[PDB]
Amino acid sequence: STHFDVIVVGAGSMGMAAGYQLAKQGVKTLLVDAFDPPHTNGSHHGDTRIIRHAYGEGREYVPLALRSQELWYELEKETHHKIFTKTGVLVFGPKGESAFVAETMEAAKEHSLTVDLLEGDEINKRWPGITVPENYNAIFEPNSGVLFSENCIRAYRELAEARGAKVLTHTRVEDFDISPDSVKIETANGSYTADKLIVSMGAWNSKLLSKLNLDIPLQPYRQVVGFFESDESKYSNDIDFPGFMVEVPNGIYYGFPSFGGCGLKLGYNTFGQKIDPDTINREFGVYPEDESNLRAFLEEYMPGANGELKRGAVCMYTKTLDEHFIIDLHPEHSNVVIAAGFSGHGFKFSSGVGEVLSQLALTGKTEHDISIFSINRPALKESLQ
Numbered sequence: 025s026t027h028f029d030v031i032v033v034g035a036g037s038m039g040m041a042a043g044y045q046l047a048k049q050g051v052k053t054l055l056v057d058a059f060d061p062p063h064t065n066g067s068h069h070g071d072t073r074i075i076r077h078a079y080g081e082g083r084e085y086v087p088l089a090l091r092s093q094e095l096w097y098e099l100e101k102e103t104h105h106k107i108f109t110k111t112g113v114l115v116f117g118p119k120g121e122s123a124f125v126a127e128t129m130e131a132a133k134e135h136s137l138t139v140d141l142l143e144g145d146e147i148n149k150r151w152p153g154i155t156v157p158e159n160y161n162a163i164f165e166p167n168s169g170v171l172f173s174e175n176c177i178r179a180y181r182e183l184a185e186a187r188g189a190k191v192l193t194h195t196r197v198e199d200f201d202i203s204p205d206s207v208k209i210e211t212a213n214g215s216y217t218a219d220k221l222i223v224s225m226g227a228w229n230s231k232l233l234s235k236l237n238l239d240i241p242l243q244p245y246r247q248v249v250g251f252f253e254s255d256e257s258k259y260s261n262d263i264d265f266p267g268f269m270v271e272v273p274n275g276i277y278y279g280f281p282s283f284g285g286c287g288l289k290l291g292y293n294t295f296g297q298k299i300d301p302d303t304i305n306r307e308f309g310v311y312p313e314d315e316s317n318l319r320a321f322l323e324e325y326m327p328g329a330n331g332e333l334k335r336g337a338v339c340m341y342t343k344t345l346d347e348h349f350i351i352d353l354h355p356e357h358s359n360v361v362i363a364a365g366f367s368g369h370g371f372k373f374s375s376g377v378g379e380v381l382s383q384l385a386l387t388g389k390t391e392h393d394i395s396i397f398s399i400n401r402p403a404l405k406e407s408l409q
């Protein structure tokens with residue numbers, strides 16, 4: 025016997041941010057999650073997340089990256105939880121052989137971002153612990169950095185609840201009942217109604233959006249990361265070792281400097297096992313590529329951080345065909361908002377997306393230009409049942 029103004033299904037990276045934005049405006053919101061955010065079953069754990077401004081995936085992402093950065097700084101001031109550390113982010117690759125590096129440089133240029141350009145030995149000299157061939161070039165962004173993702177969701181939740189938002193945990197939404205003037209969700213713990221619905225179930229979007237008559241290609245991928253014992257005199261955040269995302273002949277890798285001696289963290293971005301969020305094996309090391317792919321990179325580019333494995337984590341990417349996000353209203357229901365397919369690089373934007381989702385749910389529009397994330401774009405191959 026309780027109606028809400030807005031219901032958010034999937035209170036993760038995007039959903040909890042949306043809940044915070046809605047709650048702050050006095051909007052009666054209900055957030056429902058299959059677990060208890062932040063948790064280790066979705067796509068937000070692993071402790072840290074890189075945030076970049078100069079965007080190699082496309083310069084059209086810069087505006088939202090900058091707005092998100094400002095929002096992260098605001099969150100830092102609103103909670104006791106640590107939110108962001110300005111490690112700066114280094115991007116490098118073979119000269120003339122990386123579209124990612126090239127677009128990163130062009131994005132910085134087009135938006136007048138503050139960055140350093142260096143190559144060959146200059147990279148090795150500036151950052152002891154990095155060893156790249158002389159034919160490698162790079163762009164360093166000193167003002168971007170590292171976000172503590174679990175703290176972000178935890179802070180957004182605590183703030184949202186303090187303002188009246190209700191969070192229903194360990195409740196898996198199984199179906200949706202949408203009408204022209206209301207929305208209703210079904211769960212093992214009961215049904216709820218509201219005026220608007222926000223759908224942000226991460227990897228599970230690939231299995232439940234069909235319940236909304238949507239047939240959009242979304243592939244979940246098993247993506248691991250490892251923390252390795254490193255030479256702290258070189259890889260510690262304290263000695264300014266940067267966060268990074270680089271492209272080498274065999275793919276794209278990303279990493280973080282050691283924080284308080286937790287060890288350098290590394291991940292392989294271009295490769296992962298195709299999986300189902302309900303049957304994925306979340307144990308690190310069950311595939312010999314888990315650890316081998318990482319050490320193959322370390323022994324060649326950051327030899328001093330190829331020590332004993334301290335910790336491992338298994339997480340998920342949810343890719344769209346063009347690897348661009350999906351942030352839009354449901355084509356058949358203006359009272360339903362969709363957030364999906366962040367394709368492995370959406371957390372840094374979660375703060376900004378929360379704001380966008382709030383605007384879409386309340387007004388059906390947003391001040392941000394989200395055209396590249398249209399649910400109707402061709403490269404997506406979207407359709408109905």
Ligand SMILES: *Cc1cc2c(cc1C)nc1c(=O)[nH]c(=O)nc-1n2C[C@H](O)[C@H](O)[C@H](O)COP(=O)(O)OP(=O)(O)OC[C@H]1O[C@@H](n2cnc3c(N)ncnc32)[C@H](O)[C@@H]1O
Pocket residue numbers: 033034035036037038039056057058059061065066067068070072073074075195196197198224225226227228232247248249278291339340341363364366367368369370371372373
């Ligand atoms: C996996 C990964 C991703 C990643 C990364 C490293 C790894 C190993 N590093 C990143 C980085 O350095 N910078 C960056 O910008 N992004 C990076 N990423 C990607 C980012 O983490 C993902 O894009 C992001 O987390 C996507 O957010 P989203 O909100 O989509 O996913 P979620 O956080 O998993 O939240 C979904 C929630 O919904 C719930 N759920 C699922 N099904 C249901 C049902 N049926 N009912 C109710 N709730 C449901 C989940 O429980 C989850 O909490």
Ligand SMILES: [Cl-]
Pocket residue numbers: 067340341342343365366367368369370
């Ligand atoms: Cl993702």
